[PDB]
């Protein structure tokens, strides 16, 4: 029960943040294809 | 006085038995450490059980300890 679990952050949030971190450490030589294929696009529509 | 010799030697031999009490308290405390680390949620219940084991071995140590105390006072 790591710290972020009792914080309420779902494990997907943790993976999102770790992946974003490892992306920010990528060289801008590769940030080209890192930035694309990375961003989320889906919007939500409620009931 | 061989009576006093027996009293003191017996008290010294009886007080050693608390080695089991020492090992038991140590292993119980270590087990509580591991249990809290793995599952911090049940901290309270685990600590209660640890205190129970603590006391239930302290009583067995107090058995020999009180034997020695009784020898010291009475016999």
């Amino acid at each position: 029960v790591a710290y972020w679990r009792q914080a309420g952050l779902s494990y997907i949030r943790y993976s999102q943040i770790c992946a974003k971190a490892v992306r920010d450490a990528l060289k801008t030589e590769f940030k080209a294809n890192a930035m694309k294929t990375s961003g989320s696009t889906i919007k939500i529509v409620k009931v | 006085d061989i009576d006093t010799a027996a009293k003191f030697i017996g008290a010294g031999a009886a007080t050693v038995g608390v080695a089991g009490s020492g090992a038991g308290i140590g292993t119980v405390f270590g087990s509580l450490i591991i249990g809290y680390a793995r599952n911090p949620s049940l901290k309270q219940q685990l600590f209660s059980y640890a205190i129970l084991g603590f006391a239930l071995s302290e009583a067995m140590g107090l058995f020999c300890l009180m034997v020695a105390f009784l020898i010291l006072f009475a016999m």
């Binding site: 790591a2 710290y3 972020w4 009792q6 914080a7 309420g8 952050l9 494990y11 949030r13 943790y14 993976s15 943040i17 770790c18 992946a19 974003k20 971190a21 490892v22 992306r23 920010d24 450490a25 990528l26 060289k27 590769f30 294929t37 | -």
Partner: protein, 131 residues
């Protein structure tokens, strides 16, 4: 052992055979050999140094995911972000660690604090990875 190490975008090992693997996990890293006991551990920001059947051992940083050691001795290592080491800037990793710590205090909520701690931990594991 049938190893399969993959990322949402690219596949490194597909049913490939490698002798020994060194995976991180949410409960401290460990290793995998042919008949390792089945497990369902998830990953932690770290680096997996796959030991090829021969001498070569190749080190891939992984940011999150899931390791499954199979019943039939195989392995599935899925990583949200599996980058080979050279693609990373160690100076940028340390700088990101330092900044993330900088905004550590500016967390009015506990969940925000956990967010900054997550990024900080990942960045520091990166910093150690690149040395």
């Amino acid at each position: 052992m049938s190893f399969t190490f993959a990322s949402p975008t690219q596949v490194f090992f597909n049913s490939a055979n490698v002798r020994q693997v060194d995976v991180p996990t949410q409960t401290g890293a460990f290793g995998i050999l042919a008949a390792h006991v089945p497990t369902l551990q998830v990953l932690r920001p770290g680096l997996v140094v796959v030991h090829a059947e021969d001498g070569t051992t190749s080190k891939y940083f992984v940011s999150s995911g899931s390791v499954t050691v199979n019943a039939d001795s195989s392995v599935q290592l899925l990583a949200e972000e599996a980058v080979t080491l050279d693609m990373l800037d160690l100076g940028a990793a340390k700088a990101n660690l330092e900044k993330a710590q900088s905004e550590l205090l500016g967390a009015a909520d506990e969940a925000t604090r956990a967010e900054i701690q997550i990024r900080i931990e990942a960045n520091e594991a990166l910093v150690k990875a690149l040395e």
